[PDB]
């Protein structure tokens, strides 16, 4: 509810999960640093005790034995006395980093290594279109995590949020059609999402594990948690998950060529922990769906652009067939719509404009390309919120909120136009989750009937992002006489 | 007709490699039904006395005790008190496929291996296309095993596929950019590779091992070893492995769906075997780039029918605008050479045809014209060879490349056709296609080759390739242009 939520930087959180143990060695001596309560009771004397003394002593160096390796493997899993821990190497602000957690408590003695690529690699069969990609990613990752709940999301031009795909386990709520406003999560953890591929959280009933020292002289600030796979979060966006009851929760990055594409999310309404063997399959995962939907993505854009030129043959075919032009393309209309993606269009005559699909009133018409004609426009205009631009056209809304036009003759008055609405009917009902809540939230916070009215007030009067090929087509809509 | 060099059912020849071992079962009491050659070594009882022996006292005891997780896995690490060992596990003709091989050595690599395949989708790959990524995949599978040549190989229509990548030791030849024919490989060779993506050679001087009973009783035929990896290699194809010493070596298949594209081949001068958990670490990396090179194959193949129909817009845009398409022609002869890539075409308009480019005499096109109409044909066909069809076509070298001729009806009075320039290139194939086969001592087969040279096999009065998009093209322009 703060007014920093939006603006509070992540990376002074200092807070630390329940199971991180923090450590780290400065430079030469390796001498210690800031340590965490809980950090004590695995090597068993506590943290003042810990503190202040030299690297080797308190170091297991039963443990350390592997560090020579450590430098270049980054990690590996090593018994300690009391149990299996995984080593966990980084270096951040010129300093070490150093972390443990519990292994798999699983004998494990099989799900290897890599065995875990060839079971999911399989289901890729056949990897046609953008959607059934992910599509069946989801479906992959459903038996692998073995987890509640899966969520694909693709952001915006201005990164606003909407629920892609989803894939429900039996007993819950689909919850396709919320857009996500961008608001919620903040460029920093945007910026996290890009440089960082993976994060969770075990369970939301932990707690934020204090570190001491919490300052040091030499920044005045902690130390950032990049590296650090226990970073904790937001009490804000902690809540947002109290909320949603999913004390599990797991997260994939989407990126595109240096442009954080989207979002791929798992859940699970219980706590539990994941072994240390699947999440490494992950940033395979990513790097190959990265280039693979770069590819798809690249030939889906081609063939887009081929069906638009191939759409413009039934208009050339009718263009020198016989008849009056005005008819014929009455005749053909509809079939000219999808082109555009606008709703309807018309175009100066000299004389009535005809239009179709919806309807603006007629003296409107005349009205607004009136108005039109004194802005000095070279070939064409283009606007997501003509009515911003016009109040007047603006009180007609439902009909035009952004439109596309094209002069149809640049010395005589005659133009053209594609007239488009607010995205509203667009995207479909299912944008609420319905279903009122029986606790009563403050839902600033939520998006069940909470969120998404911020979204959909900055949508408000704003129609969807154009393309511009349609806007190259134009010259050959206009090229007929 | 099958040849003897084809025909060949490798599957019931019943040959096996020496080092390993493999039995089976009869029955669901899992009774002793198949008895290899090479049994007493590590069983250290006599295989004639193996002979009808139950599983109850010849198999180990940790087998046993792990069998029941071995069914639901396969493959299993075993401890044997002579060493080291891995059985797998497969089910054909009803019986149960039990194997024995020397186990995997080194315990921290095969993670060490997850980086390897990491590095094989590193973000600077596919800086520029295809090649980078095929040539980069050899070097990385070299570094993971470590031999003697590695390359590539890609698949022909015909399937007289050729290299294009390469990964050589130092010291020794190269075959990079030689091509073979087709009947190099046998196709139902090609045909059971299909099924299975692994096939090992452990040493060219290997020699099969004998089965007791030599034919199954039930089968009449020793059970096919498509499940078994130990499965000796035909022994023509030994021939042909021997012909230049190459004493070890392994398969790497890839399809695109149902239909393989190309494999992978390696050629060690030295006899090495090489284990289960490092060939099953490989063939992820087929898979891989399998799928990844089908993405933007698929992007290109888009990306350039969206060229072509971009192309077909101004022209469709001026057939409106000009009066006679004629005129339009030979006022657009060069915007009408890139329709097909090949410049030099004409068309019969009923009459005499508008010549344009490298055309042949106006005679010889009223000649063709009466000729190819008794042919069959629905709408056209394209002629990359002319002669062969007809001796005359081929007296014009000039135009010795490919022809294709639409009439616009499949009646057609007006006329359209079109072709190519003769073009030559260079290629070179080792043994010589003139050559069909080598002799036998009694020709119960044919002998492989002896020589891997090039001959400079050069094409000669050839054309560059149809592709079938430009066919599609054709199309386009068969819609009463």
Same mark, same amino acid.
């Given at each position: 509810e703060l007014s920093q939520c939006d603006r509070e930087p992540i990376h002074l959180l200092g807070g630390i999960q329940a199971y991180g143990v923090l450590l780290a060695f400065? &430079?030469? #001596?390796?001498r210690l640093e800031v340590v965490s309560a809980n950090t004590q009771a695995l090597l068993g004397r506590p943290p003042e005790a810990l503190l202040g003394k030299t690297a080797a002593q308190v170091l297991p160096a039963e443990l350390w034995a592997q560090w020579e390796l450590l430098s270049a493997r980054g990690a590996l899993r090593v018994a300690l006395p009391s149990g299996p821990y995984r080593a966990l190497l980084h270096?951040?602000?010129?300093?070490?980093?150093?972390?443990l957690e519990p292994a798999e408590l699983q004998p494990d003695m099989e799900e290897t290594a890599l065995e875990l690529v060839r079971r999911l690699v399989s289901p890729l069969a056949g990897a046609k279109g953008t959607r059934e990609l992910l599509q069946t990613a989801a479906n992959t990752v459903r038996a692998l995590t073995g987890f509640d709940r899966v969520m694909v999301y693709r952001f915006d031009a201005d990164w606003h949020g909407e629920v892609?795909?989803?894939?429900?386990?039996? &007993?819950? #709520?689909?919850?396709?059609?919320?857009h996500f406003p961008a608001t919620d999560i903040p460029v920093q953890a945007r910026a996290l999402y890009t440089r960082n591929p993976l994060r969770l959280i075990a369970n939301a009933r932990a707690r934020p594990v204090p570190l001491v020292p919490s300052v040091v002289p030499e920044l005045g600030r902690p130390l950032d948690l990049s590296g650090s796979a226990l970073r904790s979060v937001s009490p804000i966006h902690l809540e947002y998950l109290r909320n949603m009851g999913v004390e599990a929760s797991f997260s994939l990055s989407l990126l595109k060529d240096g442009a954080l594409w989207g979002l791929i999310a798992c859940h699970h309404l219980a706590p539990l922990h994941l072994s240390y063997e699947r999440r490494r399959a992950c940033e395979v995962l990513t790097q190959l769906l990265a280039l693979q939907l770069s590819s798809e993505e690249r030939a889906a854009e081609a063939a887009e652009d081929s069906h638009r030129a191939a759409l413009l043959g039934p208009l050339a075919t009718s263009l020198g067939a016989g008849g009056t032009l005005e008819e014929a393309l009455a005749k053909d209309g509809a079939r000219v719509l999808e082109l555009t993606g606008a709703t309807g269009a018309a175009l100066l005559l000299g004389g009535e404009p005809l239009l179709v699909g919806r309807t603006?009133?007629?003296d409107e018409v005349e009205a607004l390309a009136a108005w039109l004609a004194p802005q000095p426009f070279q070939t064409s205009f283009h606007t997501e919120r003509l009515g911003s631009l016009y109040p007047p056209l603006a009180a007609r809304a439902d009909v035009a909120a952004g439109l596309l036009a094209v002069r149809l003759a640049p010395a005589s008055s005659?133009?053209?136009l594609w007239f488009r609405p607010e995205a509203v009917r667009t995207i479909s009902w299912a944008g609420n989750p319905r279903k009122p809540a029986e606790p009563e939230p403050g839902h600033a916070r939520l998006h069940p009937r909470g969120s998404f009215q911020a979204w959909e007030e900055t949508v408000r009067e704003t129609s969807p992002a154009w393309k511009r090929a349609d806007l190259a087509a134009a010259e050959g809509f206009r090229s007929a006489l």
């Open positions: 400065r &430079g030469p #001596d390796r270096e951040s602000d010129g300093l070490t980093v150093l972390e892609l795909a989803e894939s429900k386990r039996e &007993g819950m #709520d689909g919850f396709l059609g919320m603006p009133s007629m005659r133009l053209a």
